[PDB]
Write a protein that binds this ligand. Sequence first.
Ligand code: UMV
Lengths: 547, 401
Amino acid sequence: MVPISPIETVPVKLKPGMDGPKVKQWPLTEEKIKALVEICTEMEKEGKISKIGPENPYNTPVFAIWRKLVDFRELNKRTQDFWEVQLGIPHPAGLKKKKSVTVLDVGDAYFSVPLDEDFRKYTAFTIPSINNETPGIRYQYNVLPQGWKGSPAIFQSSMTKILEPFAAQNPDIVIYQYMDDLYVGSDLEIGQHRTKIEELRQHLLRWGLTTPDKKHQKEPPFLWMGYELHPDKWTVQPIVLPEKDSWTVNDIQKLVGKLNWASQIYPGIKVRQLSKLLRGTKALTEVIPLTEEAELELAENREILKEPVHGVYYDPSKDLIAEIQKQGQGQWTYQIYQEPFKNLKTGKYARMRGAHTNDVKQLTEAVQKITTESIVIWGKTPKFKLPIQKETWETWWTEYWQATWIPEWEFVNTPPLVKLWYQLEKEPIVGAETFYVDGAANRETKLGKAGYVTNKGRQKVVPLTNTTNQKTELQAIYLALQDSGLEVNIVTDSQYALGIIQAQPDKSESELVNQIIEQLIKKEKVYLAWVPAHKGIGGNEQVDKLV
Amino acid sequence: IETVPVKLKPGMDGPKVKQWPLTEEKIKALVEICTEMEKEGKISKIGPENPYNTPVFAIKKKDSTKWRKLVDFRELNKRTQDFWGIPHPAGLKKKKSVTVLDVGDAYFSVPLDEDFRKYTAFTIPSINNETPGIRYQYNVLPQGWKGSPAIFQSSMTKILEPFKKQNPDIVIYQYMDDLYVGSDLEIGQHRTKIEELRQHLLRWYELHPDKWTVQPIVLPEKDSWTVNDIQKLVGKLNWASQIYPGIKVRQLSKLLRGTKALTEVIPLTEEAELELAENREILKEPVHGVYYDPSKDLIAEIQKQGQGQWTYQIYQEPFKNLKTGKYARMRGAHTNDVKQLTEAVQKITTESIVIWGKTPKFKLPIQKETWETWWTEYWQATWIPEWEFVNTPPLVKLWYQ
Ligand SMILES: COC(=O)Cc1cc(Oc2ccccc2OCCn2ccc(=O)[nH]c2=O)c(C)c2cc(C#N)ccc12
């Protein structure tokens, strides 16, 4: 017999203070009992388990469905935490084309790696006897049980330690471990590649690990994690948008899942309205009628998902490009590619939940997201193509009160373009009228007044119902903007209004703020000055609006 | 050569902090560095039975192209038991000059407590999660850990004992992996003495605190004032009244009586000039009842002023500034606001270390996503402070300008 190399065991303990499981065994039918006796007999013959004496006080319930199924949920609750290196799957757009690619599934994955002997006593389970007239047969696991908390991590670490020397002495091939399957790839000739595969399954056989002896049962295209991997391209598995008489919550969520999953390769997928119908529903059966906006979004989605679209694999010798387009209503779409009309992948970004916003901030956020995603997938930041002029970005970041930065980028002239819609003056305007504004509201009656007095003697006070102090301050500024010329100086005491305007929004939830923005867009020069309230600053008349 | 037992705070498990993505060149640099450290026994590979993790990344310090490994031990530091204390040198900030030295290598000659090693675990990530990340743990005192200077304190005292006995006028301080050396000599004599101390440390950053002080509130001096000028003056004086008690603005607000054009020149009455003069005299005095409490956190606020200029204030209680400053240095960051903000955070943190011996909590005028995306690209220090993000534009920006 050729001596097998031992597999180093992983020391495992339970959580601090917790003890091993003690769960009562279920009563099973005579047929099920016989089945489990045969199965456990063959397994004991193979060495996966071993009979134990009555000294062991731990027990784990067992079932037959014949196939044996041990329910380790309690032991999993009591087992220590492990390091799971599987946190996010590799994205197909990050792969590099290989001339030859082979799949080698390892049979009896967890049942070939030994378990820490000091921990095996916690995996004990019993087989009930016929008519329960004899003591049930006691067993413990000698290898990694499928369903136990630590089996995937220990299996992957053992496989990695086994594969390290082979990969070191073979720098011309790439190996991926995934569950009980291995994915090898190389650019060598098909004969040399198959030869190195034989060497690999030999090296795995030296440790007692088996691979597909026949022709590898999986060949391109590979269907994996909702993806199709082809010899020269990749895509998602077919996305079919169904016809429906009426759409429900689960139908709409299925559709938004298909659209979100399909948006990584199909450019221009929008989900704002269809996901907007889910605003605080929380009822899986509640049928929601589609707005015509959502139906139109659906029509565009079907028009995009009409015929298949594929992505290419990554070439490290070419530059990495990411281009962004604005779609409206806080929606953004982007393509990552290395050659024109051949995308590596696509995606979208929706603006965050906020009371006020502008296009420049959203474009910045989308750039940050694309940057992080690109560092994840390809390990580098791409060059950007953005629908914003260089001068616009320069003015924005130089005048913005916050710090901001975009990595290397260039302007692409693809409307709609992101622009600055208004800019406030830094100094007061000579020759422009000076509007002293103020507003106030009664906290009980919700009655208020908003208005202005100007240096030319122009005055206005408007009364208001169902309002607040903030609303009357914004309303006063809006009145000054409505009744003034193309150049105006405005004096307010509202720290609230100044806080809003100094954030430079071009769009807002409050209709009053949006009207103020529309007024600012029409002005040539606006200087907004702030003064403290109730300080006897003449002109600023708190008493004119408190009547 | 003998390990000291180290434990964690009661009821606290080890750190389990996600490792953030790194570029390919940083991953390769960390692979080379960690390989070399593994050949030297400073680190060892670990198995899946270690669930703890601490973030790691790679930087490049000043005047060097060699990649350096930086571990973000913030979570482990706050989860590590408190080590006890040496009173902070109150004369280090008073000295004419201070030079900062990197003594981190000396930590790697002292072994680390065995049972604690599983808490220093870190992961070199892989691109696209293709292969599992390379997991390590430390066998010696790691750089960036707070327990490393505390444990190495005795050895460091024994190494610096001859030099301290030779020059009693030189103040020596230690924070994390850095050694702060304050003296009053000449820049040439200072550099030669620094070479003397570095070879003394071998066989076993010019910073002048005297050129930084506290900044007073100043008011304009004009021969003619506009309505806008007086309005801004009243704004700044009303703001300063939160800091100084006797500030009054009624005689200056009396000038603003009426709805006048903002650019119209208003002459100051005699009462207004007297009030402004009294406010100047009040602002020339220090703030009333401003003390430092070692049991409280230090808070630092930074305002972007434009044209590469930045202002900052370190305080504990609002309107009780312990330090104020204005960082306007330009060093290859003309077109990058985030690099400027990051260098500013590093300088402010260094000053805080020199004055109080601990780092402040920052309020950064930046969106979270931008900062967290880019700040590691410009970081050169061995420590990392804590920070939060201010999303509302503060009105007091120009009142510090
Ligand atoms: C785990 O790594 C991955 O997720 C990527 C991954 C890579 C992989 O194959 C590879 C193995 C080693 C290096 C690169 C590989 O793909 C390069 C790109 N590609 C892909 C398919 C093809 O024909 N031709 C190609 O040039 C296979 C065969 C996978 C198979 C399955 C299945 N079933 C799942 C993922 C797979």
